[PDB]
């Protein structure tokens, strides 16, 4: 039954949801290298979040499994016996997992080293990366949303999920007629506020909108939230992440008993300082452990940052240009043919990326025998698993099918794009697969993708847990 499997995929692909759509599909046995199936394998397509497959691959190469990202605090000289220090610098180096308690535990160290007073200004130094925040062809109307958060070297991640450059916004109703309450989260007194929202009557029209008007740093809230409505929480992106990190640090410094007499802003370590005094540091977890919340959940902010820290290592420049050449190179050096690949970001958000499916499977093949093979696969969403940090974006897909708990694969989906590629490990040889499609008019053909993935898990020697 190998001819018979082809019959099946051929049929699953005649689906009426793939109308006008160029789908590209490859399936490869790892152990025997035999090509199980190939349809439009060398066609050039937009890979959405599948691009992260390449990014994460090059990130383990250029940076290693053992790489950590540093964050430090700097004055000109040690703190006065009086207590006094001048201008102080919160300086990040591309930690994609920097938290609020992490900031606070840095603010401890500044107090716990003899600082009682900053008489000067507080500066945020995200100069490890350049200040180009968004890729050329990202859509301005997407900017308000998490997947489109601005790129800095020094960005405060939010939550267990380490969503970068963002703020949680809570909107609670009051009584009907009164305007709604609006919590700006971290960005309280950093981000501007326009609150035109209102509490509507009990059980009425919920028409609440949250948006950050393009090219401002105002969170703007409109519409009605009914009085009996369960409180609304929303992640929004703020302008200049690093400056918010500076603000959250001013706040951290104050509660940790350190006065700041000046302002918060952006600015670099003057370089006209000789033996600059580092009075607080912080190391992030290793890359292997950061791969988890990144790949599992498909973190965009993370990928770009990694690209930029790749350009750092190889070239000494957190540039998108620099990094992407670095991503290109690492891949080449890993044995993968980068002919059909066009690189434009690390997250695959941009519609100016291109991958062939043959290339995906190529990379899946290769990464399957690198030293970091085991950390790389640990991070890929596992099909049908309830546990968010395991299921990832495959938590509520393929449950109770041959696929469940078997298929590690990365999703990706945009208007007009979708991909699902990864491994199907079984008794009948390790399996690598790629499913990438564009052109479809309806919803992302997840039913079609799932169907292919499951049938492979069956072929590999698997059965549904019912
Ligand atoms: B890696 C999975 N990510 C995505 O599919 C994705 C979004 O999540 C819903 C949003 C925007 C882009 C995107 O992938 C490119
Ligand atoms: Mg605040
Ligand atoms: Mg099974």
Curated annotation (Swiss-Prot):
**Nucleotide-binding as UniProt keyword:** no
Q: Which domain of life is it from?
A: Bacteria
Give the EC number.
Answer: 3.4.16.4
Whether Hydrolase counts among this entry's keywords is: yes
The entry marks the following residues as binding substrate, namely 410
Record's subcellular location: Secreted
**SUPFAM superfamilies reported for this sequence:** beta-lactamase/transpeptidase-like
List the Pfam families. Answer: Peptidase_S13 (PF02113)
Per the record, its GO cellular-component terms are:
extracellular region
Region annotation (Absent in class-A beta-lactamases) ranges: 97-270
- Name any Gene Ontology BP term: regulation of cell shape
| Mechanisms controlling activity | Inhibited by benzylpenicillin, cephaloridine, ampicillin and cetiofur.
Q: Which InterPro entries match?
A: Beta-lactam/transpept-like (IPR012338), Peptidase_S13 (IPR000667)
- Which principal EC class is assigned to this enzyme? hydrolase
Keywords, A to Z? Antibiotic resistance, Carboxypeptidase, Cell shape, Cell wall biogenesis/degradation, Hydrolase, Peptidoglycan synthesis, Protease, Secreted, Signal
Instruction: Give the active-site positions.
Output: 49, 52, 298
Q: Which reaction does it catalyse?
A: Preferential cleavage: (Ac)2-L-Lys-D-Ala-|-D-Ala. Also transpeptidation of peptidyl-alanyl moieties that are N-acyl substituents of D-alanine
Q: Which NCBIfam families match?
A: PBP4
Question: What family is this protein classified in?
Answer: Belongs to the peptidase S13 family.
Record function comment: Removes C-terminal D-alanyl residues from sugar-peptide cell wall precursors.
Question: What is the name listed in the Swiss-Prot or TrEMBL entry for this protein?
Answer: D-alanyl-D-alanine carboxypeptidase
In which organism is this protein found?
Answer: Actinomadura sp. (strain R39)
């Amino acid at each position: 039954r190998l001819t018979e499997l082809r019959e099946d995929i051929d049929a699953i692909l005649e689906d009426p949801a793939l109308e006008g759509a160029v789908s590209g599909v490859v399936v490869v046995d790892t152990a025997t290298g035999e090509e199980l199936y190939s349809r439009d394998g060398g066609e050039q397509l937009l890979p959405a979040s599948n691009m992260k497959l390449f990014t994460a691959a090059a990130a383990l190469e250029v940076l290693g499994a053992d790489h950590s990202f540093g964050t430090e605090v700097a004055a000109e000289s040690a703190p006065g016996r009086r207590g006094e220090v001048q201008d102080l610098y919160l300086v990040g180096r591309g930690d994609p997992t920097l938290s609020a308690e992490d900031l606070d535990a840095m603010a401890a160290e500044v107090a716990a080293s003899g600082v009682r007073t900053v008489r000067g200004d507080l500066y945020a130094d995200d100069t490890w990366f350049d200040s180009e925040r968004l890729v050329d062809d990202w859509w301005p109307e997407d900017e308000p949303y998490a997947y489109s958060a601005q790129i800095s070297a020094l960005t405060v991640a939010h939550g267990e999920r380490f969503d970068t450059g963002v703020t949680e916004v809570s909107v609670t109703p009051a009584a009907e007629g009164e305007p709604a309450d609006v919590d700006l989260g971290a960005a309280e007194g950093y981000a501007e506020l326009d609150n035109r929202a209102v509490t509507g009557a009990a059980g009425s029209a919920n028409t609440l909108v949250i948006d950050r008007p393009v090219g401002t740093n105002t969170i703007a809230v409109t519409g009605s939230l009914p009085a009996d409505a369960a409180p609304v929480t929303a992640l929004r992106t703020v302008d200049e992440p690093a400056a918010l990190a500076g603000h959250l640090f001013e706040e951290a410094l104050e509660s940790n008993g350190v006065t700041v007499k000046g302002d918060v802003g952006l600015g670099g370590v003057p370089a006209d300082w000789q033996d600059a005094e580092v009075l607080a540091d912080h190391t992030s977890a290793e890359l292997s452990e950061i791969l988890v919340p990144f790949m599992k959940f498909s973190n965009n902010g993370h990928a770009e940052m990694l690209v930029k820290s790749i350009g750092q290592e190889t070239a000494g420049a957190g540039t998108w240009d620099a990094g992407l050449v670095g991503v290109e190179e690492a891949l080449s050096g890993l044995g993968v043919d980068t002919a059909g690949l066009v690189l434009n970001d690390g997250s695959g958000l941009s519609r100016g990326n291109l991958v062939t499916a043959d290339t995906v499977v190529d990379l899946l093949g290769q990464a399957g025998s690198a030293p970091w093979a085991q950390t790389w696969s640990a991070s890929l969403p596992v099909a049908g698993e309830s546990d968010p940090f395991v299921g990832g974006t495959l938590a509520n897909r393929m449950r109770g099918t041959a696929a469940e708990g078997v298929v590690e694969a990365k999703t990706g989906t945009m208007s007009g794009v979708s991909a699902l590629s990864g491994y199907v490990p079984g008794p009948e040889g390790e399996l690598a697969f790629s499913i990438v499609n564009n052109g479809h008019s309806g919803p992302a053909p997840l039913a079609v993708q799932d169907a292919i993935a499951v049938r492979l898990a069956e072929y590999a020697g698997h059965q549904a847990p019912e």
